[PDB]
Curated annotation (Swiss-Prot):
It comes from Homo sapiens. The fibrinogen C-terminal domain mediates calcium-dependent binding to carbohydrates and tethering to the cell surface in monocytes and granulocytes. The domain undergoes a conformational switch at pH under 6.2, and looses its carbohydrate-binding ability. Keywords: Calcium, Cell membrane, Collagen, Disulfide bond, Glycoprotein, Immunity, Innate immunity, Lectin, Membrane, Metal-binding, Repeat, Secreted, Signal. Extracellular lectin functioning as a pattern-recognition receptor in innate immunity. Binds the sugar moieties of pathogen-associated molecular patterns (PAMPs) displayed on microbes and activates the lectin pathway of the complement system. May also activate monocytes through a G protein-coupled receptor, FFAR2, inducing the secretion of interleukin-8/IL-8. Binds preferentially to 9-O-acetylated 2-6-linked sialic acid derivatives and to various glycans containing sialic acid engaged in a 2-3 linkage. The chain holds residues 110 to 326 of 326 of the full protein. A carbohydrate binds at residues 173-175. The gene is FCN1. Changing residue 141 to F: Inhibits binding to the 9-O-acetylated sialic acid derivatives. Disulfide bonds join 2-30, 9-37, 161-174. Belongs to the ficolin lectin family. Its main location: secreted. Residues 46-134 are annotated as: B domain. Homotrimer. Interacts with elastin/ELN. Interacts (via Fibrinogen C-terminal domain) with FFAR2. Interacts with CRP; may regulate monocyte activation by FCN1. This is Ficolin-1. The record marks 191, 203 as: Mediates specificity for sialic acids.
Length: 217
C-alpha cells in the first residue's frame, strides 16, 4: 500500500533490495511510479531520472514529451518533468551525475541538493552547493533557470538555446552542460550540441554514457 510502501530507492535499499533495477515507489499524492534504482554507485539508493548509453533514443523532443517522460526501461530514457518534480518536492535530495567517455574513463559530479519546481514555474532548477567530483562543475551556471524545449523557449537568451544546441535543459545563455543533446559519439566538429559537460571534456566531445540520479540528503 501507499501507507507502507517505499517513497524512493533509498527506502528500497533500506528494505534489502541490493541489485539495481526497476521498482515501484509511491509519490507524495500516492500515485505509483516505476523507477530505476541504482543500488551500486557510491553507497546505492539513487533514483535515476536520465540515462544515455548508445544513441538509440531521440532526445530532441518537445515540451509534452519531456513533461510526461519517454524512452525505455531496457535502455535510454527521461523519467518525465512531472515525475521529477514529485520526486524532489518533499525533503531534500542530493544530485549525482555519472559520465563515461569512449576511452572508458568514469567521471562524476555531486550537488548537495536538487529540486525542480512544478509546471507553473516551468520546472525551474533549484540547485544546492557543488560537492565535488572528477567531472567538475557544469551545472551551477544553470541554477534558477526554467526548463526549455525546442517548442517552449524559457531561457535567458535572445536566441532559442534548445534549438541552437539541439537538446532540452535548464538553458541560460546558453549552457555549460547539455546532457540531453545529440549522441555525437566522442569528438565532434559542431559546437556545443552534443552530450557535453564542458568542465571535463569541453564543448566538442560527446559522452558515451550519462546518468542523472537523486537520493535523500
Ligand atoms: C555553448 C554556450 O552556451 N556557451 C556560452 C557562451 O557562448 C556565452 O558567451 C557564455 C556567457 O555566460 O556562456 C557560455 O555558457
Ligand atoms: Ca530565448
Amino acid at each position: 500500500s501507499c501507507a507502507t510502501g517505499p517513497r524512493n530507492c533509498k527506502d528500497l535499499l533500506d528494505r534489502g533490495h541490493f541489485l539495481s533495477g526497476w521498482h515501484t515507489i509511491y509519490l507524495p499524492d500516492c500515485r505509483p511510479l516505476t523507477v530505476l534504482c541504482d543500488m551500486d554507485t557510491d553507497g546505492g539508493g539513487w533514483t535515476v531520472f536520465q540515462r544515455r548509453m548508445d544513441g538509440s533514443v531521440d532526445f530532441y523532443r518537445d515540451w509534452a514529451a519531456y513533461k510526461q517522460g519517454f524512452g525505455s526501461q531496457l535502455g535510454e530514457f527521461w523519467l518525465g518533468n512531472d515525475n521529477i518534480h514529485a520526486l524532489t518536492a518533499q525533503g531534500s535530495s542530493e544530485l549525482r551525475t555519472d559520465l563515461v567517455d569512449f576511452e572508458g574513463n568514469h567521471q562524476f559530479a555531486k550537488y548537495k541538493s536538487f529540486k525542480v519546481a512544478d509546471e507553473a514555474e516551468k520546472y525551474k532548477l533549484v540547485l544546492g552547493a557543488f560537492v565535488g567530483g572528477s567531472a567538475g562543475n557544469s551545472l551551477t551556471g544553470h541554477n534558477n533557470n526554467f526548463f526549455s524545449t525546442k517548442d517552449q523557449d524559457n531561457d535567458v537568451s535572445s536566441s532559442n538555446c534548445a534549438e541552437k544546441f539541439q537538446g532540452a535543459w535548464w538553458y541560460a545563455d546558453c549552457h555549460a552542460s547539455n546532457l540531453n543533446g545529440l549522441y555525437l559519439m566522442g569528438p565532434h566538429e559542431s559546437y556545443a550540441n552534443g552530450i557535453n559537460w564542458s568542465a571535463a571534456k569541453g564543448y566538442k566531445y560527446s559522452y558515451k554514457v550519462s546518468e542523472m540520479k537523486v537520493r535523500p540528503a
